[PDB]
Structure 1
Amino acid sequence: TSAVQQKLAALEKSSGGRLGVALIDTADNTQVLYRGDERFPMCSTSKVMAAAAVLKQSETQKQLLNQPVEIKPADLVNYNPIAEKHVNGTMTLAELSAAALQYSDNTAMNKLIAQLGGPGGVTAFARAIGDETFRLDRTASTLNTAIPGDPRDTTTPRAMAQTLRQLTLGHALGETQRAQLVTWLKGNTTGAASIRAGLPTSWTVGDKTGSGDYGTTNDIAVIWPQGRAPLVLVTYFTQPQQNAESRRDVLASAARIIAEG
């Protein structure tokens, strides 16, 4: 047991919930895992997978990101800050992908799903790039029920960390695709209190947050310090009571403990 895993263990005990962390230090390709193979509800962290899948399709249909998609009142779901600005109008698949990743728009997520042919189209792209753990089964308005023990819409920290590495650092996507996912993640507006809050302010972070019932509080991030090999960090958190408040502070503390070592 390394010192870091004693600190996250104490953090988890302090929190009252269940913590899951996966770190990948690409320098020595070493990993730090805490509940790295346990299953966690992804919530809106699933949005990275589907946007990466649309960009993949963009690798043969060069103008797909420019394609306009109608947004209609029937399309509004549970939480749609951006798309309901364009009801009875259009958004491009580029603007839909930015909306899902940077504001956690659920209608933008659902348009990404429809473009891939259903949730099985998102899960398919996971298997295509070696991810045999990711599974997406529901659309946006119900995928975040975060029911304990429910296998729907889950993955492990170890699996999501390696996948995020392949999408932004490796070559799962073409270079214009891989760079474009990075610009999206670097302009996320929802992760100030999460992973970003536990890291030195001299670091650049692209991140994607997720939340749901049972106090589920998630964040997945790619981090570039200033003069060392980049990092991939995944922090998953969920709690016993269905009505639990969100605990974004636990994600920053986990990042803080990780970066402290």
Structure 2
Amino acid sequence: VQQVQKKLAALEKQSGGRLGVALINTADNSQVLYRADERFAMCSTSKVMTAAAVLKQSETHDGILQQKMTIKKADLTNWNPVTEKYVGNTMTLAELSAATLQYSDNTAMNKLLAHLGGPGNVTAFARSIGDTTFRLDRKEPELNTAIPGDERDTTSPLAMAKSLRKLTLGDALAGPQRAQLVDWLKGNTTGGQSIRAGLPAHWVVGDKTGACDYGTTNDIAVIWPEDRAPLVLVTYFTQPQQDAKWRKDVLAAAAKIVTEGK
């Protein structure tokens, strides 16, 4: 265990950046923490709490996920892998949530934020489930500045791990909604070189990555090691240079270190 701590410490030192890790083993509620209470820019990982807020609404508003929103060339941002295919057309909130979570579409995220009434409403949702650390302050793409010392759009590894657990395995969301969030996370297409890369290939994983300024490379996930109790893992990482290159390999290494033998 302290060997795990030594390995994480060495990983961070060799990386030249700041690493934040929080692992929750639901088998016994044990935890592996590294700078777990420190704040890190969430960047696209904030889309999980956002999508979850929409899901929460569907618990009391029948068919909300089928509600349509119009996409216009003017809505496009710096990253629209899915939405650019719908310019001049409509997308359902479910499609927007899927695009946001599985392709990290920025325009999709903004549509969800607009629907919800703004970032503040996502912060409110977080508080409703007991997360007093999480905070969403801006929309896309500004929420990705990840400026050192800035608390806007940040959270801690442990707070995000606990919230991810509550949302996917706990009671923060009702059954159908909980299942939909788990399905969307499992279907993510951008995590291939992150947390997943540090795990045995047949383990089942649901995750949401992040890549923004200051070489900030993030990933939060729920991991099912074969037939054993699921693990909730948050790996956040940021660097000194605003234009630093992303280090998905660092997240993979952190993941292997804390999950080996689980």
Class of the TM-score when normalised by the shorter of the 2 chains: over 0.9
Which shifted more, 73-82 or 15-24? 73-82
Deviations 1:133-191 (A, max 9, x none): 00000001110011000000000001000000000000100100000001100000000
| Alignment TM-score, normalising by the size of structure 2 | 0.98
What aligned pairs does 1:149-164 form with structure 2 within 5 A after superposition? 149-164=149-164
Q: Please list every run of 5 or more consecutive structure 1 residues that lacks an aligned counterpart in the other structure.
A: none
Matched, 1:20 2:10: no
Aligned counterpart, 1:242 = 242
Aligned counterpart, 1:66 = 66
Specify the SS of the correspondent of 2:200. Answer: coil
Aligned counterpart, 1:4 = 4
Matched, 1:187 2:175: no
Aligned counterpart, 2:77 = 77
Aligned counterpart, 1:42 = 42
In structure 1, C-alpha distance between the alignment counterparts of 2:3 and 2:104, rounded to whole Å: 35
In structure 1, C-alpha distance between the alignment counterparts of 2:183 and 2:79, rounded to whole Å: 23
Q: Please list every run of 5 or more consecutive structure 2 residues that lacks an aligned counterpart in the other structure.
A: none
Matched, 1:110 2:114: no
State the one-letter code of the partner of 1:34: Y
Matched, 1:97 2:89: no
Matched, 1:257 2:257: yes
What aligned pairs does 1:214-229 form with structure 2 within 5 A after superposition? 214-229=214-229
Q: How many residues align?
A: 261
State the one-letter code of the partner of 2:237: F
What aligned pairs does 1:162-181 form with structure 2 within 5 A after superposition? 162-181=162-181
Specify the SS of the correspondent of 1:91. Answer: strand
In structure 2, C-alpha distance between the alignment counterparts of 1:67 and 1:208, rounded to whole Å: 24
Deviations 1:35-88 (A, max 9, x none): 000110000000000100000000111100001110012111111111011011
Q: CA deviation at 1:240?
A: 0.4
Aligned counterpart, 2:207 = 207
Specify the SS of the correspondent of 2:144. Answer: coil
Aligned counterpart, 2:137 = 137
- Runs of 4+ in structure 1 deviating by more than 2 angstroms, as ranges, are none
State the one-letter code of the partner of 1:155: T
RMSD: 0.8
| Alignment TM-score, normalising by the size of structure 1 | 0.99
In structure 2, C-alpha distance between the alignment counterparts of 1:249 and 1:238, rounded to whole Å: 13
The percentage of counterpart residues that share the same residue type is 75
State the one-letter code of the partner of 1:149: G
Aligned counterpart, 2:147 = 147
Q: CA deviation at 1:227?
A: 1.9
In structure 1, C-alpha distance between the alignment counterparts of 2:151 and 2:259, rounded to whole Å: 31
In structure 2, C-alpha distance between the alignment counterparts of 1:178 and 1:259, rounded to whole Å: 24
In structure 1, C-alpha distance between the alignment counterparts of 2:62 and 2:190, rounded to whole Å: 30
